Write a protein that binds this ligand. Structure first.
Ligand SMILES: [Cl-]
Ligand SMILES: [Cl-]
Ligand SMILES: [Cl-]
Ligand SMILES: [Cl-]
Ligand SMILES: [Cl-]
Ligand SMILES: [Cl-]
Ligand SMILES: [Cl-]
Ligand SMILES: [Cl-]
Ligand SMILES: [Cl-]
Ligand code: NA
Length: 129
């Protein structure tokens, strides 16, 4: 599923992501924009053989099981395929664990490089929320 911007903002809010660990909704929408272009089926293979999955490009090295990342963990206790669903529940639940892990949203390198410090409220501007 390719979400629209306000559609994703609304789904993130339903699922309790807004202001989660102090990150406003525009931070999450911005991170999703640059991680996946709002596509729940986005995947990206990393040099180390791990893979990033879904709207927030959650990585198999730590967070989900894909059976093809030696030595990895599955801290969200889900198959990485669950992260590609139309329904963003698994991605949100896992993102809450990631953002709680110590470095906040810096865990998402695209957020650090493209969202951090910018006018992230633009991402929710005009949305009926
Ligand atoms: Cl915001
Ligand atoms: Cl992989
Ligand atoms: Cl994701
Ligand atoms: Cl497996
Ligand atoms: Cl594995
Ligand atoms: Cl599994
Ligand atoms: Cl959803
Ligand atoms: Cl933080
Ligand atoms: Cl950018
Ligand atoms: Na894994």
């Amino acid at each position: 599923k390719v979400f629209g911007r306000c559609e994703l903002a609304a789904a993130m809010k339903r699922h309790g992501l807004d202001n989660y660990r102090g990150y406003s909704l525009g931070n999450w929408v911005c991170a999703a924009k640059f991680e996946s272009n709002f596509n729940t089926q986005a995947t990206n293979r990393n040099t180390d053989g791990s893979t990033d999955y879904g709207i927030l490009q959650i990585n198999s090295r730590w967070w989900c099981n894909d059976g093809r990342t030696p030595g990895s963990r599955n801290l969200c206790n889900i198959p990485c395929s669950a992260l590609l669903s139309s329904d963003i529940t698994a991605s949100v639940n896992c993102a809450k664990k990631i953002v709680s892990d110590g470095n906040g949203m810096n865990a998402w390198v695209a957020w650090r490089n493209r969202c951090k410090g910018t006018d992230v409220q633009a991402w929710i501007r005009g949305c009926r929320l």
